[PDB]
Amino acid sequence: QVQLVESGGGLVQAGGSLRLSCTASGYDFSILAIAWYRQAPGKERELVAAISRVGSTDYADSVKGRFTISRDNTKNTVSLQMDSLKPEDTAVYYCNAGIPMTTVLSGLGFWGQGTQVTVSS
């Protein structure tokens, strides 16, 4: 079965940088699309980033130009780098897996456990 494990996160000051990692197991990593969503207390889940199986990338307008997405197929890992982080970015980030049918982009794909990210003023 599809299995995702989120790692990284933590507390960072405003203007700093952070990294989240998503480890994949139980399926074929080469033919899958993977995305990061985020949810804050009292806020609806919104998309942060997405990368398809062919290296195509997509970002949210709120994070476009600041967040970077990559995926190492050999290690079956997906890495997100956040630069110039701001307090609004504080949230729990979820790694989502979906066949690139808009399934990953629609949020109907597999889910992991999530990782906390806190950005102080």
Partner 1 sequence: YRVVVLSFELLHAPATVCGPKKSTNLVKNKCVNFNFNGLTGTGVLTESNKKFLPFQQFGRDIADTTDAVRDPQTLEILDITPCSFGGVSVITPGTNTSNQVAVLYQDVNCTEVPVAIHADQLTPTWRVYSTGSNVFQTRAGCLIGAEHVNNSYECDIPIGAGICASYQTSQSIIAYTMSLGAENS
Partner 2 sequence: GIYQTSNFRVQPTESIVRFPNITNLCPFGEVFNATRFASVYAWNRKRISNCVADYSVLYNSASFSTFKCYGVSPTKLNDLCFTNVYADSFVIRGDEVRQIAPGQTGKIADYNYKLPDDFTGCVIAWNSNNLDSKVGGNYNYLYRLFRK
Residue selected from 76, 79, 103, 118 as contacting its own copies according to rule CB under 8 A? 79
* Nearer CB in complex with partner 1: 85/95: 95
Q: How many residues bind partner 2 (CB under 8 A)?
A: 14
Interaction between residue 97 and partner 1 (CB under 8 A) = yes
When the beta carbons of 9 and 109 are compared against its own copies, the nearer one is 9
What does 51-117 look like in DSSP terms, one character per residue? E-TTS-EEE-TTTTTTEEEEEETTTTEEEEEEES--GGG-EEEEEEEE-TTTHHHHT-SEE---EEE
Q: Which helix (H) or strand (E) holds 23?
A: strand 17-25
Residues that bind partner 1 (CB under 8 A): 1-2, 27, 32, 97-99, 101, 103, 108-111
